[PDB]
Design a protein around this nucleic acid. Structure first.
Length: 189
RNA sequence: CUGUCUGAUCAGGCAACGCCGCGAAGCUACCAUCUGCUGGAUUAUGGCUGAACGCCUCUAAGUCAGAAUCCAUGCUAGAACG
């Protein structure tokens, strides 16, 4: 129906800065720096003050307006990742065969290696994304910790681990073995 | 090797390739031997982040993986007016 104007407000905490220029957002905080390209969306920005930013869609239909809260959430995730960080936790689940998980460095590249999944001789290796750190928890058995500044990279890389451990040609209601995300949260709670 | 002809011998001719054994060379047989490559993008499907719709959601923007598929790599020809 082409709403004349829709607005959202970005809250930027006391220790972050947000530089925006030609739909390229650069978010600096105590934990580092994150940048996101928004050239695929028609939006405009205004600086209310040092603690707030207005995001506006002029004369937008239903779908274009739907793409405004999405932008706000993506940039807010940039802020909360450069302040608090992002931590996902994965539990190793199996009935009989334990799942052997190791962080290796083949060719200077960190890889997650999964061995003995359902007794298979095949070895599964999942690349570790840049800016993401994996770690075997030393306080909970059979648990992998995925941490970083970028929620997108952290969650996608945890998903890559989860997807690589799919059971085939068996009743997956009975054969529940896998590596599953058990906790999504921040590094600095 | 047979029949016949050159008188015999030797050496030969003919039998509308006379017949039999072997037979190189050449050709040839899953009847013999050798050889048949590796990158990218996808479909179905499963996902991530994420609004619409204060929740939710793989989908709307964006995005990951993924088939004997597709485009290449490689192989054959080389436009007889490139």
């Amino acid at each position: 129906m082409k709403y004349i104007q829709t607005d959202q407000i970005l809250d930027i905490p006391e220790g972050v800065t947000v530089d925006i220029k030609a739909r390229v957002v650069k978010v600096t905080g105590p934990r580092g720096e994150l940048t996101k390209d928004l050239k695929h969306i028609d939006v405009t920005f205004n600086k209310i003050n040092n603690r707030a930013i207005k995001i506006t869609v002029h004369n937008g239909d239903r779908k274009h307006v739907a793409a405004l809260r999405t932008v706000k959430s993506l940039i807010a995730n940039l802020i909360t990742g450069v302040t608090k960080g992002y931590k996902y936790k994965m539990r190793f689940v199996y009935a009989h065969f334990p799942i052997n998980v190791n962080i290796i460095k083949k060719d200077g590249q960190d890889y997650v290696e999964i061995r003995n999944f359902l007794g298979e001789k095949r070895v599964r290796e999942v690349k570790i994304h840049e800016g993401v750190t994996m770690e075997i928890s030393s306080t909970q058995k059979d648990e992998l910790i995925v941490s970083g500044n970028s929620l997108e990279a952290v969650s996608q890389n945890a998903a890559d681990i989860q997807q690589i451990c799919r059971v085939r040609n068996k009743d997956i209601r009975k054969f529940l073995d896998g590596i599953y995300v058990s906790e999504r949260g921040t590094i600095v709670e």
